[PDB]
Each structure stands twice: as C-alpha cells, then as structure tokens.
Paper text:
[name] is a highly abundant tegument protein in [name]-1 that has been suggested, based on sequence analysis, to be unique to the alphaherpesviruses. [name] has been suggested to be important for the secondary tegumentation of the virion and the accurate localization of several important herpesviral proteins, including the transcription activating protein VP16, the outer capsid protein VP26, the interesting E3 ubiquitin ligase ICP0, the major transcriptional regulatory protein ICP4 and the essential multifunctional ICP27. Sequence analysis and secondary structure predictions reveal that [name] consists of a non-conserved N-terminal domain and a conserved C-terminal domain with the clear presence of secondary structures. To generate insight into the [name] structure and function, we crystallized and solved the structure of the conserved C-terminal domain of this protein, hereafter referred to as VP22core, to a resolution of 1.9 Å.
Each asymmetrical unit consists of a molecule of VP22core, with visual electron density for residues 174–260, together with three amino acids from the N-terminal purification tag. The structure of VP22core is constituted by a long central α-helix (α1) flanked by a long random coil (L1) at the N terminus, two shorter α-helices (α2 and α3) and one β-strand (β1) at the C terminus. Two VP22core monomers are related by the crystallographic twofold axis and are slightly twisted around each other, creating an elongated dimer where the α1 helices and the β1 interact in an anti-parallel fashion. The dimeric state of VP22core has been proposed previously and our light-scattering results show that VP22core is mono-dispersed with a mean molar mass of ~26 500 g mol−1. On the peak side, the dimerization of β1 creates a flat plateau where two conserved arginines (Arg242) create a positively charged peak in the middle of a less charged area. The electrostatic potential surface map of the groove, which is created by L1 and α1 from both monomers, shows two large and positively charged patches. Interestingly, we observed a stretch of unaccounted electron density next to β1. We managed to model a six-amino-acid peptide into this density. It corresponds to the sequence SSGSVD, which is a part of the linker region between the N-terminal His6-tag and the TEV protease cleavage site. This peptide is most likely contributed in trans from a neighbouring subunit in the crystal lattice, which is not part of the crystallographic dimer. Although sequence homology of [name] has only been established within the alphaherpesviruses, the crystal structure reveals that it shares extensive structural similarity with ORF52 from Murid herpesvirus 68 (MHV-68) (subfamily Gammaherpesvirinae).
Residue numbers in the entry:
A (entry chain B): 8 to 13
B (entry chain A): 21 to 110
The structure:
Amino acid sequence: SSGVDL
Amino acid sequence: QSMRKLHFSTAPPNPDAPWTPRVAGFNKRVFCAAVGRLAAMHARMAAVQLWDMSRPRTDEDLNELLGITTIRVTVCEGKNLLQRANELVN
C-alpha cells in the first residue's frame, strides 16, 4: 500500500 | 467505531462452511472498513507530505494548495489486510 501526491 | 479491532467472524466451523446471511453481512462490513482505514491513513500521509512541502501560511496560500491537491493511494495488503488496518494509530 502507498499514497502520493501527483 | 474506528477504534474497533477488525476481525472476520469466527462463527463458520471450517474454511468451506457456507456463511449465514448474518456472517456474510458482518464480514462485508469488516472488509470494507479495513480497506477504508488503510486508504485514509495513506491519503493523510500523502497530505502531510504535500502540506509540509508547500508550507502554506496564508488563506491565499491555502486556496492555491487546494487547487493542486491530487492525492492517489493504493490499498494492497493481501492476507495481511486486517492486521495492517488494526496496526494503525490515529
């Protein structure tokens, strides 16, 4: 799982 | 109830036993809750990163930041889904 801003 | 430790029902007697409607409904809610929690946690982490890099310090800054906020997250934990969701803090 991960999370990032464009 | 996002404090609650998530676990699938222990009611089914063996792995191949058909779930009652009650158990199916219960497990559905647990599955969706875990996915939602992990997504929230990863999105907040991304938001913290974006915020920290921007360091908005006026309402105008914030208006600008809102315009560019595009946060993409993926939940992929396999068999560890519930464990990972329960490990979360805040």
